[PDB]
């Protein structure tokens, strides 16, 4: 295990904190929240979306072929 007081070394760093009864738990939830969600999705969409679009195209083609491959031809 590991304990507080034996983790690492830190110097010259100040932390200011406020009590949770002095502040609001939902401050600017929609005012600042939505623009941050847009930035987060914008920053990662190009890395996540393409492979799942690639899956979507294979999925529709493969079923479209199979769904009609067992249709009959005049010959």
């Amino acid at each position: 295990g590991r304990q507080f007081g034996h983790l690492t070394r830190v110097r010259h760093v100040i932390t200011y904190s406020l009590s949770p009864f002095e502040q609001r738990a939902f401050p600017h939830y929609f005012s600042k929240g939505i623009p941050n969600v847009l930035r987060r999705t914008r920053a990662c969409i190009l890395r996540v979306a393409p492979p799942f679009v690639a899956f979507y195209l294979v999925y529709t083609w493969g079923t479209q072929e199979f769904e009609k491959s067992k249709r009959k031809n005049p010959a």
């Binding site: 304990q3 507080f4 007081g5 904190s17 009590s19 949770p20 009864f21």
Partner: protein, 49 residues
């Protein structure tokens, strides 16, 4: 003003200012083991009471 004080007085007076109140904390030095403020704040009441 002192002789008035008995045990009932300190319990009433202390609870008025200490019990379930938000403290101000100040730390300086090797204070990695200084408890987090939420933990400090929970030390200002007893669930048994």
């Amino acid at each position: 003003r002192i002789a008035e004080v008995d045990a009932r007085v300190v319990r009433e007076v202390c609870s008025k200012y200490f019990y379930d109140q938000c403290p101000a904390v100040a730390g300086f030095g090797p204070i990695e083991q200084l408890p987090d403020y939420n933990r400090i704040r929970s030390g200002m009441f007893w669930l048994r009471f």
